[PDB]
Design a protein around this ligand. Structure first.
Ligand SMILES: CC(C)C1=CC2=CC[C@@H]3[C@](C)(CCC[C@@]3(C)C(=O)N[C@@H](Cc3c[nH]c4ccccc34)C(=O)O)[C@H]2CC1
Length: 452
C-alpha cells in the first residue's frame, strides 16, 4: 500500500556509490538483498536504480508492455567497444531489430546441426589435452573451459582458429577483454572518473579496445579472401523488413559482441557445473551414468546431445545457483505501480538480481541452496519468470540454444571419458568481471581410457 523502499547504508554526498568499491559487487548486492528483502533503492550522484530479488516483483518487471531493456551503467561502459551490437543496443535503435531479424536464423535448428561438427573439433581438443596429462597433474578448470568456449565461437561463428589449446597463456583477445570488463566493472564505483589518477586506466582501456578490434578486422579480412556461418549472415543476410544488409560499422560491433557474449558466460557455466558435480557426488554419478548410456559412439552426434536430458538439467541447476550473466536492467515505459506498493515514473530503472531471484524460497522451497537438477524435470511445475538466466522477452539471449548445445556436448564428453577428484577440497571463490566464474578451481581427471 505505497510502501517506503529500503536503502542500504550511505556515505554522505557519495550516497550508496562506495558499496560498489569491491572486487565482488554482485556478491555485495546479494548480501544487501538478504538484509533488505525483495526490493531496495541504490543511489549514486545523479542516478538511482531499484534492485529486485523476488519472483513476486520480477514476474511484473518481465511484462514487456510495461518495461523495456535498459542499458545499465555496466552496459553503457561495455558499449564503448560493443557499440550498437545486439547486447548493447536499445530496442528502439534501428540496428537492434534489423540485426535480430538477420542473425536469428544463424540460431535455427538447421544452423545448430551445421555448427555441431566444429563444436566436436574443439571438444575433442579438450579431451585429448586431459588424456595427455601426466600422473598427479591437475586441470585448471575455468582456464580450460575458456580455451574451449572461445575456440568454439571463433570456429563455428567465423571459421577462425584462436588455437587456445596451443597456448599456456590466454589468447591476447582474452587478456584484453578481461581487462576491459574489469575496467568497466571498476568505473562503476569511480566518483570523479576525470581524475588524472585514471589517465593510465583510460590509455590501457583504449589499448585493450585496439587488441580486440585488430582481431576483428583480421576475422573480416580472412573471410573476404574467400562458408555458411554467423559471419556469412552478418556480411550477406538481408532484413526481410527493409531488404537491407548490416553496415560495416555494425558488423564489427556484432563480431566483438559474439566473441565476448558467445564464450565468457558459457565458460562460467561449464566451470560452475563441474564445481557442483564434484561437490555433489550422487549427482555426478547420475550424470556420468547418462553420458555412458547415451554417448555410444567415438564422436557424439547432434541427436545424442539432444538425449543428454539429465546433463541438460545439471546445466539449468548450475544457472539457477550461479547465473553467469548475473543481472539485467529494465526501464518503465510509462508510470506504473510495482506489486501494488511501489509507484514508478516513466524512465525509472530496475535491476534484476538473478542469483537472488533463483534463491526465492517461496518458489524453490527451503532447500534453495542445495544442488538438485531434478527441480527441472517439468517446466510446467515452475512458476512464471522464476528462472531467468537468459534474460527476458524479445531481449532474451539469442545464443541460449548454442550455449546449451555446446555445454551439453562438452560436459557429456567430460563425464564419459574421466572420473573427477576435488583433490584440494576447493573453497568456492567467485571472480567478478561483470560475469561470474570460479577462480582457482582445480580438479584431477582420471582417464576411463575410452578411445576417441
Ligand atoms: C555483461 C553482463 C552480464 C553484465 C551485467 C551487469 C549488470 C549489473 C552490474 C554488473 C553485474 C556489474 C557490477 C555492478 C552491477 C551489479 C550494477 O548493478 N551496476 C549498475 C548500477 C551502477 C553500479 N555502479 C554505477 C556507477 C555509475 C552508474 C551506475 C552504476 C549499472 O551498471 O548500471 C553488470 C555486469 C555486466
Amino acid at each position: 500500500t505505497i510502501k517506503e523502499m529500503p536503502q542500504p547504508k550511505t556515505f554522505g554526498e557519495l550516497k550508496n556509490l562506495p558499496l560498489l568499491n569491491t572486487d565482488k559487487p554482485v556478491q555485495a548486492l546479494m548480501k544487501i538483498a538478504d538484509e533488505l528483502g525483495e526490493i531496495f533503492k541504490f543511489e549514486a550522484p545523479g542516478r538511482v536504480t531499484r534492485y529486485l530479488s523476488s519472483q513476486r516483483l520480477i514476474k511484473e518487471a518481465c511484462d514487456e508492455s510495461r518495461f523495456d531493456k535498459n542499458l545499465s551503467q555496466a552496459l553503457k561502459f561495455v558499449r564503448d567497444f560493443a557499440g550498437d551490437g545486439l547486447f548493447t543496443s536499445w530496442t528502439h535503435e534501428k540496428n537492434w531489430k534489423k540485426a535480430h531479424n538477420i542473425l536469428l536464423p544463424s540460431f535455427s535448428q538447421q544452423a545448430m546441426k551445421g555448427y555441431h561438427a566444429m563444436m566436436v573439433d574443439i571438444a575433442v581438443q579438450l579431451v585429448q589435452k586431459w588424456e595427455r596429462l601426466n600422473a598427479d597433474e591437475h586441470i585448471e578448470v575455468p582456464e580450460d573451459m575458456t580455451r574451449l568456449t572461445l575456440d568454439t565461437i571463433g570456429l563455428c561463428g567465423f571459421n577462425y582458429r584462436f588455437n587456445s589449446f596451443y597456448r599456456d597463456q590466454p589468447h591476447p583477445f582474452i587478456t584484453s577483454m578481461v581487462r576491459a570488463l574489469d575496467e568497466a566493472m571498476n568505473k562503476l564505483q569511480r566518483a570523479n572518473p576525470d581524475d588524472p589518477a585514471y589517465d593510465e586506466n583510460k590509455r590501457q582501456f583504449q589499448e585493450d579496445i585496439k587488441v580486440m578490434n585488430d582481431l576483428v578486422d583480421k576475422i573480416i579480412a580472412d573471410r573476404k579472401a574467400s562458408s555458411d556461418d554467423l559471419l556469412t549472415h552478418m556480411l550477406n543476410g538481408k532484413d526481410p523488413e527493409t531488404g537491407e544488409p548490416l553496415d560495416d560499422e555494425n558488423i564489427r560491433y556484432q563480431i566483438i559482441t559474439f566473441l565476448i557474449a558467445g564464450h565468457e558466460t558459457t565458460s562460467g557455466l561449464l566451470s560452475f557445473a563441474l564445481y557442483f558435480l564434484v561437490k555433489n557426488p550422487h549427482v555426478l554419478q547420475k550424470a556420468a551414468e547418462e553420458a555412458a548410456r547415451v554417448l555410444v559412439d567415438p564422436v557424439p552426434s547432434y541427436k545424442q546431445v539432444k538425449q543428454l536430458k539429465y546433463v541438460g538439467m545439471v546445466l539449468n541447476e548450475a544457472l539457477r545457483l550461479w547465473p553467469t550473466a548475473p543481472a539485467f536492467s529494465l526501464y518503465a515505459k510509462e508510470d506504473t505501480v510495482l506489486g501494488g506498493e511501489y509507484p514508478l515514473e516513466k524512465g525509472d530503472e530496475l535491476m534484476v538480481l538473478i542469483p537472488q531471484l533463483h534463491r526465492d524460497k517461496t518458489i524453490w522451497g527451503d532447500d534453495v541452496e542445495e544442488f538438485r537438477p531434478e527441480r527441472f524435470e517439468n517446466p510446467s511445475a515452475i512458476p512464471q519468470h522464476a528462472f531467468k538466466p537468459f534474460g527476458n522477452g524479445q531481449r532474451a539471449c539469442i545464443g541460449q540454444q548454442f550455449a546449451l548445445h555446446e555445454a551439453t556436448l562438452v560436459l557429456g564428453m567430460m563425464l564419459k571419458h574421466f572420473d573427477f577428484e576435488d583433490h584440494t577440497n576447493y573453497e568456492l571463490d567467485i571472480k567478478e568481471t561483470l560475469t561470474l566464474k570460479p577462480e582457482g578451481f582445480v580438479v584431477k581427471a582420471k582417464s576411463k581410457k575410452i578411445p576417441l
